[PDB]
C-alpha cells in the first residue's frame, strides 16, 4: 500500500524534495601553497559546518581503510569499506579545525587532511546556499 | 585546532565539543593515579 | 585402571551442553517478548496480496511477478517481449491431457 | 609470615582497587559516546586515495 | 571469599578449610558467578535504572546540604552568575 | 497526531519524520551498513507498486540517500537499471530456495 | 679430548683464526647495506638523484643554497 | 613500612595535579561564559581556491 | 588554539608560567635565515590589507 | 600440612578434593613409581600450591575474568539483534526481519546505561546535558547526577550544588544567552 | 662442524649472533625513520620516493619483532640455559633444533631479497587488508617470510614442550616463563597462519574476502588475536630473565615463587582474550568494547604483582657486594623502565582516551618503552650474566658505567618527546608533518643518531 512507505504530508502535497551536494577536497600541494596556509594541513576545499548544532558524520572508505580524526572536535572513526559508522558531534565554538588520516592507506597517507570549519548557523545557511 | 610549537598539551588541547573536553577530562582523572604508581614504585628501587 | 574424565564425559557434555543452549534461549525470548511463531514468508504485503489473487484465479496462472509492477528494469523488460502467458496455460493443459 | 602475608594482598589488591576505581568512569564514557542524540543534520564522508569526499544536503 | 586474606580463612574456619583442594575450587566458583551474575543482573536487566526522581542522598548529601542552605550559599552557588554573552562597552 | 503515532503504523516511519536521526532497529550499532540497505530495499519496493515518478519513493530515495553514500547508491543503482540487483528481484524469480 | 671438552674451543681458548671475526662483521655489515642502497636506487629511479637536498620538495628562497 | 613513606610521597606529588585539573575545570567553565578569547559571529568561510 | 590562550593567560596570572616556545626558534632553519625575505609575498600581503582596508570602510557604510 | 605419610589427609567428597586430585596428579607422571615416593611427590606439590595463601587471590581472579568472559559471549548470542544463528530471518530481505527488530530495543537500553549516563556532568565542564532531550523515545530522557563518581574524580565538588559556576554552564542557560542574541535554536 | 651443528647450546649462540646481524639492519632502518623526521621536508626520501618510507617503517617492525627480539629472547638465552636449568643432557629434540635456525635464516634472507628485487612498498607490519593485498610482490614475499618464521617458532615451541617429560629437577620461574610462551605460540599461531593464507588468498588466488560484501575487519579480529598474544610471548621470557638476575645477584631466594608462577599464567590467559583493544576505532558494539576495555585493565593486577615482587628481591641485599655490574644495572632499569610502559598502556587502554591517541605516537613510544628499552636491556642483561658460561669476549660491557647511563638517558630522549606529539597530534606511519611538531621530532632525532654513536663504544 502506499502507507508502507511513509513520507511527509508536505512532500505529498508538492514540497519539493532535498537534493545532496558531493565535493572533493584535496591536499593543497608544495607548489601551490600561499604565505600563510599552513603546510601538510591545508585543502582546496574545506567542510563547513554550523556550530551549536547536533551533527551526524557517517563516516566510510571506498578503496582502504583511511581514518577520519579531527582532534579538536574529538573524533577518530576509521574509514572502513563495508562499515558506515555514525559520529554524532555538537561544536560548541567558531574556528577551523585541522586533522590528518590516521590509518597507513597507501603512499600518500600523510598527505590528505581533514579541514573543518565551524560557523553560525547564520554564516553556514547563507554559505550552503551559494556553495 | 591546529598543532603548536612546542607543547605538552598533556591530555589534549583545544577541545570544542563536549565530547572533547570528557576525554581531556578522563586522563586528566587518571593522571595523578599514574604518578602514585610510578613514585610509589620507584622510591622502594634500593639496596 | 585410572580414570581421569567423567564416565560418561562425551554424551554428558555435548547433550548437557545442547540442553543448556536451548533452555537458555527460550529464558532469553521470555525476558525480550520475542515472538516465537515461525513464518517461512517473505512480509511484501503488496506482492502476498498478488499471490492471494493468482490463488483465487484473478491473475491468470504463471504470470511473472515483473508482468504485474508498475516499473520494470531493462533485464525484465527483454522477458515482455518474448512472455506468453496463454501459450504456456495451453502447453500446461496438454501435458495434462497426455499423462491422464 | 603474619606480616609478609597482608603486605602480599596489598601487592594484588591495591592494583584490583585501582582497576576498580577506573571502571565506573569507563563504562560511563563509553556509554556517552554511543547515546542516542536528535541529530538535526548528515554528512557523508568517504575516505579515497588519496582525498576525503564529502557529501551534505543541499538548501531547498 | 571475597577481598578475604586466605590467611585469616584458614585460622578462623580451619574446617571449612580442612580440604584445600576443594578451598580453591570454591574460590574459583564462587567468583565465576559472581562475574555471570553481575553481566546479566547488573548491566543486561532492560528498561531498568531511569528512575532519576530517585537519586540515592546520603547522609553525607544532607549535611552539607543542610549546611549550605542554613547560610545563603546554596541560594548563592544555585543563582546563574551571568546570562548575558556581551558586556556593556562605555 | 498522537504523540506515539511514529511507533504505531510501522517502525519505518520514525526516521521518516526525522530523517537524520537513529532508526529504531539499529540504533544499537554504530555500523549503518545494514541500515542504508534496508532503505535501499524500501526504494526498491514503492518503485515496484507506485512507479518512479510517485513523491513517496522519491522521497524514499532521500532517505536511502541519508544513510547511503553515494558511491555505494550509484553501483547499486546501476545494477537496479539492468536488472541485476539482488535486493529487487522478483520474489518469484528469486533461487533463495532452491538446491537448499 | 681435551681439545673438545669445549665447545668452540679455539675461540673459547683464544686461538681462533680472526677471520672468523671479520666475517661476522662484513656480515652485519651487508645486512645493514640492504636498507641504504636500495634508498639510493629507488631516489634515483623516481627522482634522478641519488639523495635530496634538504626541502627540495617545497618553495625555497632566491638565495637558499 | 619504608613503603608507605613512598605512597605519601606519591600521595603528594599526585595531589598536585589534582589541583591544576581542579583549577582546569575552573577556567573551562568561565571560557564561554565571560573569557573575551570566546568569540561568535566571527570565522568566515573562506570558499573554494 | 583560543583556549590554549585563554588558559595561559590564567596560569601566568596565578603565578610562575614558563613556555619554551617563547624562547626558543621553532625551526632549525633559524641560522641561515636571519636576512632572508620573500618579497613577492611582502608586496602581494600589502595590496590585500589595502584592499581590505577599503572594503571595511564599505562595510562600515 | 603434615609432615609424616601415616598422617592421612582429609580429603570432601566431589569432584574437585584431595582424593580426586590425587587419583589424576600422578597419571601422566614418571617420578611416581612407587607409593612412598608417590605419595611424597603429591604432598610436595599440594602443599607447595594450595597451602600457598597468595595463589588463592589468583583464583579469585581467573574465575571473575572467565565468568564475565562467557557471559558476554552467551549475552551477544542470545541478546544481539545483529547476531544470527537461526536463519529464518537470513532467508529475507531486510524490511522483513521482524522478529530480529525485537531484539533491538530491548538492547538498546541496557540497565547500566540508564544508571551510568546520568553521571557524565563528571567528566564534561560545560553543557555536559547537551545530549540528555530528545523527543523521539527510544532511550530515556536523562537527568544529571547530584554527586560526582566516586573515586578518583578529587578536581570536582563531591555534590554538584556544592559548585558555584555548574548552574551557569547548563546548556538551559547557554541556550538563553545565545538565543538571546538570535544566534542559534540550541 | 658449523651449520650441521645439534648442540643445543651452540645453537643458543647462533640464534643470538643472527639477532645481532639481523639488528643491524633493524637500526639502520630505524636511522632512517628518524634522519627523515628531523625537520619537515625531504631529507633523505624523495618524495617520488615515498613508498619507500613505508617499506622501511614496514620492515623495521616485522625484523625487530619476528627476526630479533624474538630469536633472540625465545631462541637464543631459553636454547643455552633451559636444558641446562632443567638438569637435562640436551634439548629433548636435537634435530628439529637445527633446523629452526636455520629456516630463521633463510627466511630473513627471502625478506631482504625482496627489498633488493622486488618494487619497495609499504603496508605496515599489522598488513591490513585491503591495502596489503592490492600491492605488489614484494608483499607476497613478506607472507612467505612470516610463515616461513611461524614453522619455526612452533617447532621450537613443541621443543620446549617437550621439556616437562624429561625435567630432572625443579621447574624454575624462568622455565615457567618459557612453557607458557610455548603453549601462547600453539594456540595463537595456527590463527595466524589462517588469516595469513587468506591474505594470500586474494592476492593470489582471486579470492574476495577482503571486498565490499566481504568484511575487512575480519582480518584484524584474527590477526590481533595473535597480535596481542604475541607482545606476551615476547615479554614473558624478559620477565623470566629478570627473575633469575635479581635473585641471583642479591644473593636473595625468589620471594612469592608461586605467585610469580600464577601471575605469568594469569597474564597468559587474560593476554589470550584481550585483543580488541586494537580494534577500538574501527566502530564495535558498546557491551563488546566494555569487555575489552575491563580484562585489559584486568592484566595490570598480575603484572603488578610480579614487579612488586622484584622490587623485594633488591631491597635489603648487602651493601659489601658491587652494584655498578651492567647485568644488575640493566635488570633494575627494566623495572623502572617497564613501569613507564605499563602505565602508558593502561592510559591507552581506556577506549575514550584512545580515540585521541590511536594511530599516534603515543602508542609508538609506549610500546618502544617496553621493547626497544625493557626487552632489549632485559636480553643484554641476560647474555651479561651469562658471560662466563657463554664465554664471549673482545668488548668492554661486563663493567660499563658510561654505557649504561649513556643508553638510559639518550633512549629516552628519543621516546619521551613522541609522548608529548601524540597530543599535539602528530600520526604514526607518517614521513611528512606540520612545522609546528618540529621540535620535538627534532629532539627525538638527536637522541637516535646519539644512541647508534653509543653501540660503537662497546667494541
Ligand atoms: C647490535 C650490534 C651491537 C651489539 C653490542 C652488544 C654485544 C654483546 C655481546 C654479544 C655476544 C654474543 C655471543 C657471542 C659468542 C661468540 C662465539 C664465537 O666466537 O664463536 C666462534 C665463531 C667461529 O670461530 P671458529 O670456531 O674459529 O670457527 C672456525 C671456522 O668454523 C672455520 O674457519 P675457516 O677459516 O675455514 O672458515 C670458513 C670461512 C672461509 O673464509 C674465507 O676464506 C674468507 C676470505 C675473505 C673474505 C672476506 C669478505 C670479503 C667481502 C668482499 C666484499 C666486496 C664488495 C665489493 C663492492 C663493490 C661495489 C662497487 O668462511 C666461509 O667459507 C663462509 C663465510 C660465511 C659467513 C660470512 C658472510 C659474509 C657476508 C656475505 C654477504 C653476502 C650477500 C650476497 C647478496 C647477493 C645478492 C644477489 O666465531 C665467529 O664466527 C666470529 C664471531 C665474532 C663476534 C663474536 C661476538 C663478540 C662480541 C660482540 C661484538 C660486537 C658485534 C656486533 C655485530 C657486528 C657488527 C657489524
Ligand atoms: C599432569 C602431569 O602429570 O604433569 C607432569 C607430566 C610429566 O611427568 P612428571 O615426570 O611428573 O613431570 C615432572 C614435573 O614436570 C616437575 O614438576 P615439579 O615437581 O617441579 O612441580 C610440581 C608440579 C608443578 O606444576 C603445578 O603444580 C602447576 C599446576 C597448575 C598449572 C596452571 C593451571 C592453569 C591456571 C589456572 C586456571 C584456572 C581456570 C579456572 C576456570 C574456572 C571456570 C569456572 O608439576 C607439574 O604440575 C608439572 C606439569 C606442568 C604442566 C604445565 C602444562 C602447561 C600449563 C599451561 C597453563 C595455562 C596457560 C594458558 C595459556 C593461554 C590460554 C588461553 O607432564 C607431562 O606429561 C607433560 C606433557 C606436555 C604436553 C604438552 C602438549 C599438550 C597438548
Ligand atoms: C637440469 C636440472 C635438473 C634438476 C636438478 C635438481 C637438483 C635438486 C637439488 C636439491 C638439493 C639442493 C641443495 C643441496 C644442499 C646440500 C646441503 C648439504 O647436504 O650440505 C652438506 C654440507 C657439508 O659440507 P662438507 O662437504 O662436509 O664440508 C663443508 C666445509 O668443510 C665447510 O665446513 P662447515 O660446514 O663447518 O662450514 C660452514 C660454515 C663455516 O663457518 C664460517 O664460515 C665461519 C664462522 C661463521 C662466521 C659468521 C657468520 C655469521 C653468523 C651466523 C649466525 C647464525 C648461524 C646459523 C647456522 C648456519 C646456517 C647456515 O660457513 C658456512 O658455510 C655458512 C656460515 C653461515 C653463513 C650465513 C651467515 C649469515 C650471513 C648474512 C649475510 C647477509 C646479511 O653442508 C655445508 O657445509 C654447506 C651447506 C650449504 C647450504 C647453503 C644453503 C644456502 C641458502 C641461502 C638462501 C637461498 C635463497 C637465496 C639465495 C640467493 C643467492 C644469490
Ligand atoms: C611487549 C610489548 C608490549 C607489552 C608488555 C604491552 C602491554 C600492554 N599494552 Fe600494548 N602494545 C604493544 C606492545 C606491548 N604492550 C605494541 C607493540 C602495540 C602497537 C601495535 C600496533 O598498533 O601496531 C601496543 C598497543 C597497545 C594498545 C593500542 C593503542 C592504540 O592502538 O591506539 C593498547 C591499548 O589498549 C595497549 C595496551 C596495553 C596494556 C593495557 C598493557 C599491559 O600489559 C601493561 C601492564 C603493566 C602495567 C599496568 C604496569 C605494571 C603494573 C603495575 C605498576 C601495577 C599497578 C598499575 C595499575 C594498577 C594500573 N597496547
Ligand atoms: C622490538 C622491536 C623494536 C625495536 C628494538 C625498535 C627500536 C627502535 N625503533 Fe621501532 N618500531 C617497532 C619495533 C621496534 N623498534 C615497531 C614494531 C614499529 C611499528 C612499525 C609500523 O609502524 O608499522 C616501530 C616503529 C618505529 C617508528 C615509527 C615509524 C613510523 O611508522 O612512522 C620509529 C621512529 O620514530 C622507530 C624508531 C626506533 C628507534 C629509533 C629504535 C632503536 O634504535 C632505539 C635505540 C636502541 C637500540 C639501537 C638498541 C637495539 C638493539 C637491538 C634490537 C639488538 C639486541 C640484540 C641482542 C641484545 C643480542 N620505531
Ligand atoms: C547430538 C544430537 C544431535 C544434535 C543436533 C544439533 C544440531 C544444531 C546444532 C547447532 C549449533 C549449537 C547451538 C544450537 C542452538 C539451538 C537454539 C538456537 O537456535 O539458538 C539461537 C540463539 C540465537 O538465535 P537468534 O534468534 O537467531 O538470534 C537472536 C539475537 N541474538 O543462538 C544460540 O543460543 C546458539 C549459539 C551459541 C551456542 C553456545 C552458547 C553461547 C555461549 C557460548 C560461550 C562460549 C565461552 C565458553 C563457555 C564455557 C561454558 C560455560
Ligand atoms: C558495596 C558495593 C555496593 C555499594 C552500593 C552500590 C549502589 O547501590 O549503587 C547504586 C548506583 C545507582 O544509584 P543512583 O544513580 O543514585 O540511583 C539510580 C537512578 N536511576 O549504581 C551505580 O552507581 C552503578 C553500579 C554499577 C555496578 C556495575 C557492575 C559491573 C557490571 C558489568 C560491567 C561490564 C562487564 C563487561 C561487559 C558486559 C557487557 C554485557
Ligand atoms: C670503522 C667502522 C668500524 C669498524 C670495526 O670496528 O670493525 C670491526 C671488525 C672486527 O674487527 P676486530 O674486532 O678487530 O676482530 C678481529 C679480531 N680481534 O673489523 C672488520 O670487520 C674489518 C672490516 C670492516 C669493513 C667495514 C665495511
Ligand atoms: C583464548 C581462547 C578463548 C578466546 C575467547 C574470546 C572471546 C572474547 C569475547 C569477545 C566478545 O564479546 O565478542 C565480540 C566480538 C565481535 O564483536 P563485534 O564485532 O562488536 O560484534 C558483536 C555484534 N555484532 O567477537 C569476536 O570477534 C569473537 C571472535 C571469535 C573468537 C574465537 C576464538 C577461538 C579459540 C579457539
Ligand atoms: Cu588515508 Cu591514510
Ligand atoms: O598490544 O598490547
Ligand atoms: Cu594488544
Ligand atoms: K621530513
Ligand atoms: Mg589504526
Redesign the interface.
Known amino acids: 500500500s502506499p502507507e508502507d512507505y511513509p513520507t511527509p504530508q508536505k512532500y505529498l502535497e508538492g514540497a519539493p524534495i532535498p537534493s545532496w551536494y558531493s565535493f572533493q577536497s584535496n591536499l593543497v600541494g608544495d607548489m601551490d601553497l600561499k604565505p600563510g596556509m599552513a603546510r601538510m594541513l591545508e585543502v582546496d576545499k574545506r567542510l563547513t559546518v554550523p556550530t551549536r548544532t547536533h551533527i551526524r558524520f557517517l563516516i566510510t572508505g571506498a578503496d582502504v581503510i583511511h581514518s577520519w580524526s579531527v582532534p579538536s572536535l574529538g573524533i577518530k572513526c576509521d574509514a572502513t569499506p563495508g562499515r558506515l559508522v555514525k559520529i554524532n558531534t555538537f561544536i560548541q565554538r567558531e574556528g577551523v579545525f585541522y586533522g590528518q588520516c590516521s590509518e597507513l592507506c597507501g603512499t600518500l597517507h600523510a598527505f590528505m587532511p581533514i579541514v573543518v570549519e565551524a560557523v553560525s548557523p547564520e554564516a553556514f545557511a547563507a554559505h550552503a546556499k551559494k556553495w | 585546532d591546529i598543532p603548536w610549537p612546542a607543547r605538552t598539551d598533556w591530555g589534549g588541547h583545544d577541545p570544542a565539543t563536549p565530547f572533547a573536553e570528557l576525554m581531556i577530562n578522563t586522563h586528566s582523572m587518571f593522571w595523578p593515579v599514574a604518578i602514585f604508581i610510578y613514585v610509589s614504585a620507584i622510591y622502594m628501587v634500593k639496596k | 585402571g585410572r580414570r581421569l574424565l567423567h564416565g560418561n564425559y562425551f554424551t554428558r557434555y555435548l547433550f548437557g551442553s545442547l540442553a543448556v543452549i536451548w533452555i537458555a534461549e527460550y529464558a532469553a525470548a521470555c525476558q525480550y517478548g520475542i515472538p516465537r511463531h515461525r513464518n517461512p514468508n517473505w512480509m511484501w504485503s503488496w506482492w502476498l496480496e498478488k499471490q492471494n489473487q493468482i490463488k483465487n484465479g484473478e491473475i491468470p496462472a504463471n504470470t511473472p511477478g515483473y508482468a504485474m509492477v508498475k516499473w520494470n528494469n531493462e533485464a525484465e523488460q527483454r522477458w515482455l517481449k518474448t512472455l506468453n502467458v496463454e501459450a504456456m496455460n495451453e502447453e500446461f493443459a496438454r501435458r495434462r491431457e497426455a499423462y491422464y | 609470615y603474619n606480616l609478609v602475608m597482608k603486605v602480599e594482598f596489598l601487592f594484588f589488591y591495591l592494583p584490583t582497587i585501582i582497576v576498580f576505581g577506573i571502571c565506573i568512569p569507563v563504562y560511563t564514557i563509553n556509554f556517552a559516546q554511543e547515546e542516542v542524540i536528535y541529530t538535526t543534520m548528515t554528512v557523508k564522508v568517504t575516505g579515497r586515495q588519496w582525498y576525503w569526499v564529502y557529501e551534505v544536503e543541499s538548501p531547498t | 571469599s571475597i577481598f578475604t586474606p586466605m590467611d585469616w580463612m584458614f585460622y578462623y574456619f580451619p574446617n571449612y578449610s580442612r580440604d584445600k583442594v576443594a578451598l580453591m575450587a570454591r574460590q574459583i566458583k564462587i567468583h565465576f558467578a559472581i562475574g555471570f551474575a553481575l553481566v546479566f543482573l547488573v548491566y543486561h536487566p532492560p528498561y531498568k535504572g531511569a528512575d532519576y526522581g530517585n537519586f540515592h542522598k546520603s547522609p553525607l548529601y544532607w549535611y552539607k546540604y543542610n549546611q549550605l542552605e542554613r547560610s545563603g550559599q546554596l541560594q548563592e552557588n544555585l543563582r546563574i552568575k551571568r546570562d548575558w554573552f556581551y558586556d556593556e562597552d562605555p | 497526531e498522537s504523540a506515539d503515532a511514529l511507533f504505531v503504523g510501522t517502525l519505518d516511519r520514525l526516521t521518516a519524520e526525522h530523517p537524520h536521526t537513529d532508526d529504531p532497529r539499529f540504533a544499537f550499532q554504530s555500523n549503518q551498513w545494514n541500515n542504508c540497505e534496508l532503505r535501499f530495499t524500501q526504494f526498491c519496493r514503492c518503485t515496484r507498486e507506485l512507479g518512479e515518478d510517485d513523491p513517496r519513493c522519491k522521497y524514499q530515495y532521500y532517505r536511502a540517500q541519508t544513510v547511503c553514500h553515494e558511491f555505494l547508491l550509484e553501483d547499486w543503482m546501476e545494477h537496479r537499471h539492468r536488472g541485476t540487483c539482488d535486493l529487487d528481484i522478483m520474489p518469484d524469480r528469486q533461487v533463495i530456495h532452491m538446491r537448499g | 679430548n681435551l681439545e673438545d671438552h669445549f665447545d668452540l674451543a679455539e675461540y673459547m681458548m683464544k686461538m681462533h683464526n680472526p677471520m672468523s671475526e671479520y666475517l661476522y662483521w662484513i656480515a652485519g655489515f651487508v645486512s645493514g647495506l640492504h636498507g641504504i642502497l636500495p634508498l639510493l636506487h629507488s631516489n634515483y629511479y623516481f627522482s634522478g638523484m641519488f639523495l635530496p637536498r634538504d626541502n627540495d620538495n617545497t618553495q625555497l628562497c632566491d638565495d637558499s643554497w | 613500612r619504608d613503603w608507605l613513606i613512598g605512597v605519601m610521597l606519591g600521595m603528594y606529588l599526585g595531589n598536585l595535579c589534582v589541583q591544576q585539573h581542579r583549577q582546569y575545570r575552573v577556567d573551562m567553565k568561565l571560557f564561554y561564559l565571560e573569557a573575551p578569547e570566546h568569540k561568535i559571529n566571527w570565522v568566515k568561510p573562506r570558499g573554494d581556491l | 588554539n583560543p583556549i590554549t590562550r585563554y588558559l595561559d593567560r590564567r596560569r601566568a596570572e596565578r603565578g610562575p608560567y614558563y613556555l619554551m616556545s617563547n624562547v626558543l626558534p621553532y625551526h632549525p632553519h633559524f641560522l641561515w635565515m636571519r636576512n632572508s625575505h620573500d618579497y613577492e609575498a611582502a608586496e602581494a600581503l600589502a595590496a590585500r590589507r589595502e584592499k581590505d582596508r577599503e572594503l571595511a570602510a564599505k562595510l562600515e557604510a | 600440612p603434615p609432615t609424616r605419610l601415616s598422617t592421612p589427609l582429609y580429603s570432601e567428597g566431589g569432584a574437585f578434593t584431595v582424593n580426586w586430585w590425587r587419583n589424576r596428579y600422578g597419571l601422566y607422571s614418571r617420578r611416581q613409581t612407587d607409593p612412598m615416593l608417590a605419595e611424597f611427590l603429591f604432598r610436595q606439590q599440594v602443599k607447595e600450591w594450595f597451602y600457598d595463601v597468595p595463589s588463592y587471590n589468583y583464583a579469585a581472579l581467573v574465575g571473575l575474568a572467565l565468568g564475565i568472559l562467557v557471559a558476554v559471549i552467551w549475552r551477544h548470542f542470545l541478546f544481539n539483534p545483529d547476531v544470527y544463528v537461526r536463519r529464518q530471518e537470513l532467508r529475507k530481505m531486510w524490511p522483513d526481519r521482524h522478529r530480529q527488530f525485537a531484539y533491538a530495543v530491548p538492547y538498546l537500553n541496557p540497565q547500566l546505561k540508564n544508571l551510568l549516563l546520568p553521571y557524565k556532568n563528571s567528566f564534561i565542564d560545560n553543557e555536559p546535558d547537551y545530549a540528555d532531550y530528545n523527543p523521539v523515545g527510544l532511550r530515556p530522557q536523562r537527568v544529571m547526577a547530584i554527586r560526582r563518581i566516586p573515586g578518583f574524580f578529587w578536581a570536582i565538588p563531591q555534590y554538584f550544588f556544592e559548585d558555584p559556576l555548574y548552574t551557569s554552564c547548563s546548556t538551559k542557560n547557554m541556550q538563553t544567552i545565545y538565543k538571546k542574541l538570535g544566534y542559534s535554536e540550541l | 662442524f658449523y651449520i650441521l651443528v645439534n648442540?643445543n647450546?651452540?645453537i643458543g649462540?647462533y640464534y643470538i649472533?643472527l639477532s645481532?646481524?639481523?639488528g643491524?639492519?633493524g637500526?639502520?632502518?630505524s636511522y632512517?625513520i628518524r634522519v627523515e623526521l628531523?625537520?619537515?621536508?625531504?631529507?633523505?626520501?624523495?618524495?617520488?620516493?615515498?613508498?619507500?618510507y613505508?617499506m622501511?617503517i614496514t620492515?623495521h617492525g616485522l625484523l625487530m619483532i619476528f627476526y630479533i627480539i624474538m630469536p633472540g629472547l625465545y631462541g637464543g638465552i631459553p636454547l643455552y640455559i633451559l636444558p641446562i636449568l632443567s638438569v637435562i643432557t640436551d634439548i629433548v629434540l636435537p634435530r628439529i633444533n637445527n633446523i629452526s635456525i636455520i629456516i630463521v635464516l633463510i627466511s630473513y634472507i627471502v625478506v631482504?631479497n625482496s627489498?633488493?628485487i622486488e618494487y619497495?612498498?609499504?603496508?605496515?607490519w599489522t598488513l591490513?587488508p585491503?591495502?596489503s593485498i592490492?600491492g605488489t610482490v614484494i608483499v607476497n614475499m613478506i607472507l612467505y617470510g612470516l610463515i616461513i618464521i611461524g614453522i619455526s617458532s612452533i617447532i621450537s615451541a613443541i621443543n620446549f614442550m617437550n621439556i616437562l617429560?624429561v625435567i630432572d629437577g625443579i621447574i624454575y620461574v624462568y622455565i615457567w616463563s618459557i612453557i607458557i610462551t610455548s603453549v601462547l605460540l600453539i594456540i595463537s599461531l595456527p590463527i595466524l597462519n589462517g588469516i595469513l593464507l587468506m591474505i594470500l588468498s586474494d592476492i593470489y588466488f582471486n579470492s574476495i574476502y577482503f571486498?565490499?560484501?566481504?568484511?575487512?575487519?575480519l582480518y584484524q579480529h584474527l590477526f590481533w588475536y595473535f597480535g596481542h598474544p604475541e607482545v606476551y610471548i615476547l615479554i614473558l621470557p624478559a620477565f623470566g630473565i629478570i627473575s633469575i638476575i635479581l635473585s641471583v645477584l642479591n644473593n636473595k631466594i625468589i620471594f612469592?615463587m608461586?605467585?610469580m608462577i600464577?601471575?605469568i599464567?594469569?597474564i597468559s590467559?587474560?593476554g589470550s582474550?584481550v585483543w580488541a583493544h586494537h580494534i577500538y576505532?574501527?566502530?564495535?558494539?558498546?557491551?563488546?568494547?566494555?569487555?575489552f576495555?575491563?580484562?585489559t585493565?584486568?592484566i595490570?593486577?598480575?603484572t603488578?604483582?610480579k614487579?612488586?615482587?622484584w622490587?623485594?628481591l633488591?631491597?635489603?641485599?648487602?651493601?659489601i657486594l658491587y652494584?655498578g655490574y651492567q647485568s644488575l644495572i640493566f635488570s633494575?632499569m627494566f623495572?623502572?623502565i617497564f613501569?613507564?610502559g605499563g602505565?602508558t598502556g593502561?592510559?591507552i587502554s581506556?577506549?575514550?582516551?584512545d580515540?585521541?591517541l590511536?594511530?599516534?605516537y603515543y602508542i609508538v613510544s609506549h610500546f618502544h618503552y617496553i621493547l626497544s628499552i625493557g626487552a632489549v636491556i632485559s636480553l643484554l642483561a641476560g647474555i651479561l650474566l651469562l658471560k662466563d658460561i657463554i664465554?664471549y669476549?673482545?668488548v668492554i660491557i661486563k663493567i660499563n658505567k658510561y654505557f649504561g647511563l649513556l643508553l638510559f638517558i639518550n633512549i629516552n630522549i628519543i621516546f619521551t618527546p613522541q609522548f608529548?606529539i601524540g597530543?599535539?597530534?602528530?600520526?604514526?606511519?607518517?614521513?611528512?608533518?606540520?612545522?609546528?611538531?618540529?621540535?620535538?621530532n627534532?629532539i627525538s632525532s638527536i637522541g637516535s643518531i646519539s644512541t647508534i654513536l653509543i653501540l660503537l663504544s662497546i667494541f
Open positions: 648442540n647450546k651452540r649462540i649472533k645481532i646481524i639481523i643491524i639492519l637500526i639502520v632502518l632512517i628531523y625537520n619537515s621536508g625531504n631529507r633523505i626520501i624523495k618524495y617520488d620516493n615515498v613508498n619507500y613505508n622501511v620492515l631482504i627489498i633488493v619497495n612498498i609499504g603496508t605496515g591490513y585491503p591495502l592490492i617429560i571486498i565490499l560484501n566481504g568484511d575487512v575487519v612469592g608461586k605467585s600464577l601471575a599464567i594469569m590467559i587474560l582474550i576505532t574501527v566502530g564495535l558494539e558498546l557491551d563488546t568494547k566494555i569487555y576495555n575491563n580484562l585493565l584486568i595490570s593486577i598480575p603488578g604483582n614487579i612488586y615482587n622490587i623485594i633488591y631491597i635489603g641485599s648487602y651493601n652494584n633494575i623495572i623502572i613501569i613507564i602505565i593502561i592510559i581506556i577506549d575514550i582516551i580515540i585521541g590511536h594511530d599516534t664465554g669476549y673482545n608529548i597530543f599535539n597530534v602528530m600520526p604514526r606511519r607518517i614521513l611528512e608533518y606540520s612545522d609546528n611538531i618540529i621540535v620535538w627534532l
